[PDB]
Amino acid sequence: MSLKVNILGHEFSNPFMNAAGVLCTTEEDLRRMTESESGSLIGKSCTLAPRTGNPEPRYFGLPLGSINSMGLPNLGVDFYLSYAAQTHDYSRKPLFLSMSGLSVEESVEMVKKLVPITKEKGTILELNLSAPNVPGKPQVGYDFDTTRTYLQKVSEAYGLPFGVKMPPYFDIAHFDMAAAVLNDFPLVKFITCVNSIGNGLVIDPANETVVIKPKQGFGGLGGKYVLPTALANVNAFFRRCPDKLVFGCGGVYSGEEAFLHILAGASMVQVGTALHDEGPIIFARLNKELQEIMTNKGYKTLDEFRGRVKTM
Amino acid sequence: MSLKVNILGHEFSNPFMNAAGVLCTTEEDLRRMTESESGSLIGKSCTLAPRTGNPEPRYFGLPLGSINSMGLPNLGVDFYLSYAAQTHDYSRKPLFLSMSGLSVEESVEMVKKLVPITKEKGTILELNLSAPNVPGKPQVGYDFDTTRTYLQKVSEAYGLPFGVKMPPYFDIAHFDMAAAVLNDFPLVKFITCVNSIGNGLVIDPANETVVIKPKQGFGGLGGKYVLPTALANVNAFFRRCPDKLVFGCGGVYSGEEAFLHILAGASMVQVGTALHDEGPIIFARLNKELQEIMTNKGYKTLDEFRGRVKTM
Numbered sequence: 001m002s003l004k005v006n007i008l009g010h011e012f013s014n015p016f017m018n019a020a021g022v023l024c025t026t027e028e029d030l031r032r033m034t035e036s037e038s039g040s041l042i043g044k045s046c047t048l049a050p051r052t053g054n055p056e057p058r059y060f061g062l063p064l065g066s067i068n069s070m071g072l073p074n075l076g077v078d079f080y081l082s083y084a085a086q087t088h089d090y091s092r093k094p095l096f097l098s099m100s101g102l103s104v105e106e107s108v109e110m111v112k113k114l115v116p117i118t119k120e121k122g123t124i125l126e127l128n129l130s131a132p133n134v135p136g137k138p139q140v141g142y143d144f145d146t147t148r149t150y151l152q153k154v155s156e157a158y159g160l161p162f163g164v165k166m167p168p169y170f171d172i173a174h175f176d177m178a179a180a181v182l183n184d185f186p187l188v189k190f191i192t193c194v195n196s197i198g199n200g201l202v203i204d205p206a207n208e209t210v211v212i213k214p215k216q217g218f219g220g221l222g223g224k225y226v227l228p229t230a231l232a233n234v235n236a237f238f239r240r241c242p243d244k245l246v247f248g249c250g251g252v253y254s255g256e257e258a259f260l261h262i263l264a265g266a267s268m269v270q271v272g273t274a275l276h277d278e279g280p281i282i283f284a285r286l287n288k289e290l291q292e293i294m295t296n297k298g299y300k301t302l303d304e305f306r307g308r309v310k311t312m
Numbered sequence: 313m314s315l316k317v318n319i320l321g322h323e324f325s326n327p328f329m330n331a332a333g334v335l336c337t338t339e340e341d342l343r344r345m346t347e348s349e350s351g352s353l354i355g356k357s358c359t360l361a362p363r364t365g366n367p368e369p370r371y372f373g374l375p376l377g378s379i380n381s382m383g384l385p386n387l388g389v390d391f392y393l394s395y396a397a398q399t400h401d402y403s404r405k406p407l408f409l410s411m412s413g414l415s416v417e418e419s420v421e422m423v424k425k426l427v428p429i430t431k432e433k434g435t436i437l438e439l440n441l442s443a444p445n446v447p448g449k450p451q452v453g454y455d456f457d458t459t460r461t462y463l464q465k466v467s468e469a470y471g472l473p474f475g476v477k478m479p480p481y482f483d484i485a486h487f488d489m490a491a492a493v494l495n496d497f498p499l500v501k502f503i504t505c506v507n508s509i510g511n512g513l514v515i516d517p518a519n520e521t522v523v524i525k526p527k528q529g530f531g532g533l534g535g536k537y538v539l540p541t542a543l544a545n546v547n548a549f550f551r552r553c554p555d556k557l558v559f560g561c562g563g564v565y566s567g568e569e570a571f572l573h574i575l576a577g578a579s580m581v582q583v584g585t586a587l588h589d590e591g592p593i594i595f596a597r598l599n600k601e602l603q604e605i606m607t608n609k610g611y612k613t614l615d616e617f618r619g620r621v622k623t624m
């Protein structure tokens with residue numbers, strides 16, 4: 001069976017890539033993702049200038065996933081642009097860059113720099129509208145006026161196909177409102193559902209203390225916590241945004257979860273917490289497991305079942 | 313040693329009660345809750361007229377909790393009012409009633425009927441601003457203008473202290489905005505955090521079909537999925553609304569989870585999915601387990617640690 005995905009003129013060997021933020025901050029990280037069996041990779045959500053991020057501890061692995069408040073530690077846009085222009089081996093796989101300016105002005109400055117490199121190399125933009133661990137910066141995706149402004153200014157500045165990393169929604173009316181904004185921007189060719197379930201709290205019963213230092217212990221949840229939310233968001237936008245692709249992100253630990261994401265509507269499938277836990281070898285495993293399911297069900301390609309989840 | 317709680321003018325034997333919607337729809341349900349070891353109980357979220365709710369299947373037990381789209385099945389406000397006025401044994405424990413009118417006009421008519429019964433019997437109101445499984449009805453709590461209207465009109469019609477059942481928030485700006493609205497209504501004396509994580513989607517990989525019938529498989533998540541979200545919401549409102557109580561609801565399966573809720577600021581702890589799984593015997597187990605933790609830590613009362621979660 002074929003795991004191939006054909007989107008934006010590119011051939012991807014399989015639907016798997018890292019979730020933005022995991023194994024993608026440094027040159028070494030990005031090398032390891034390139035050498036892995038993943039179909040693609042994405043750079044850390046970057047800002048105009050470098051950031052060291054939040055104080056420690058800011059990450060904690062959980063039995064059911066992860067909580068983090070990293071605070072967008074990144075080497076700055078120039079580093080990732082340079083990686084995309086000079087270092088990355090495009091013969092191995094295509095590259096995405098995530099950009100997370102803390103203002104529309106910052107985002108505009110950054111994407112303008114990407115234009116020449118997208119034209120030359122084919123580097124793909126994911127605009128992050130859901131960074132939940134920066135003190136004093138609300139998630140853009142939870143204000144539809146602000147979301148409209150970002151999409152307007154970035155569409156105009158970048159002028160090329162791009163995608164958006166969205167926060168999870170939990171209300172039908174929000175799925176509708178979000179889709180209505182997204183559908184006004186034709187250059188938005190993909191939607192990544194979802195970012196962390198924002199601002200959860202984990203407390204250690206032994207010492208009666210929170211497990212992360214920033215924001216009084218409040219951090220984004222990933223892993224097993226997020227699968228049903230992720231599947232819901234993937235399916236909601238798959239149906240509401242037929243002119244666009246949907247990328248799935250959340251709760252993928254196995255080919256089974258990957259299969260469910262694709263059944264829900266996903267084109268690419270991103271792996272965060274599970275990759276942080278296991279390392280890039282996970283991609284070899286995911287390919288094997290997804291192949292096995294497709295073999296068992298007699299699916300020859302992903303296109304035979306993408307978005308074909310059955311309702312009652 | 314004592315699990316006792318003194319709030320809203322009552323002594324509660326212990327902090328435990330059912331989550332609204334679980335073991336509280338029929339007279340038989342309410343009898344079993346009253347006979348249980350629970351410190352209190354709350355009636356099913358009711359409407360002006362009876363409802364039978366959504367078609368089957370509308371509930372599905374999961375390894376990590378539950379998904380439901382019940383659709384507010386209830387015997388109508390008159391039934392729960394008559395239970396409160398005539399049937400309930402107040403010498404056993406205090407009674408809460410949840411009310412979830414599908415419009416502000418419906419809510420007003422309902423709470424007006426409760427006034428004489430609160431005055432006579434001491435019945436407590438929990439206004440549901442987070443009912444996520446009624447098609448065409450957005451969650452009131454995710455619209456702060458609508459929330460303000462409900463609180464204004466109910467404050468006016470009811471005119472006595474009451475509480476609110478809130479949806480989970482995932483963004484610091486939303487915690488701020490929610491608290492700003494709540495803090496404008498002095499009659500709001502408690503905040504229950506949280507209702508289900510709304511509009512999750514569960515898919516069976518074997519038959520490639522959603523597991524519940526209503527809303528294309530979309531339903532509220534309960535159980536292990538929601539504990540970090542619940543703790544965060546409890547603590548966020550505990551800090552932002554110092555003139556109000558907070559009740560904890562989400563992911564309680566054991567004395568340990570109860571302990572964490574109370575540490576975060578919970579006065580009362582509600583049990584949903586776990587109670588559905590185990591039946592009312594769980595309250596005897598929870599009392600024993602909580603006391604065990606307190607014994608090990610050398611605490612004699614809940615007041616020794618309620619709201620005393622430590623940050624770094």
Ligand SMILES: Cc1cc2nc3c(=O)[nH]c(=O)nc-3n(C[C@H](O)[C@H](O)[C@H](O)COP(=O)(O)O)c2cc1C
Pocket residue numbers: 019020021022044045059066068070072098128130165194195196221222223224226249250251252270271272273274276
């Ligand atoms: C350590 C860590 C760092 C992350 N950094 C980013 C980031 O820079 N940009 C982003 O859009 N999402 C970031 N995320 C969120 C993930 O991309 C992903 O949306 C989320 O973890 C859910 O996927 P999962 O269930 O596979 O973990 C980060 C998550 C983790 C755990």
Ligand SMILES: Cc1cc2nc3c(=O)[nH]c(=O)nc-3n(C[C@H](O)[C@H](O)[C@H](O)COP(=O)(O)O)c2cc1C
Pocket residue numbers: 331332333334356357371378380382384410440442477506507508533534535536538561562563564582583584585586588
């Ligand atoms: C079968 C079922 C019915 C529910 N009905 C109601 C309801 O009528 N009103 C309400 O406010 N919450 C209702 N809920 C939500 C619960 O009160 C609770 O907030 C949620 O399940 C999270 O708690 P848990 O993790 O202990 O399940 C219901 C949940 C379930 C599972």
Ligand SMILES: O=C1C[C@@H](C(=O)O)NC(=O)N1
Pocket residue numbers: 021045068069070071072073128130131132133134195196220
């Ligand atoms: O988009 C983001 C940003 C990242 C961080 O905190 O750096 N962590 C997240 O969970 N999501």
Ligand SMILES: O=C1C[C@@H](C(=O)O)NC(=O)N1
Pocket residue numbers: 333357380381382383384385440442443444445446507508532
């Ligand atoms: O508040 C509510 C309503 C209930 C239902 O659907 O009846 N189910 C829920 O999960 N929460």
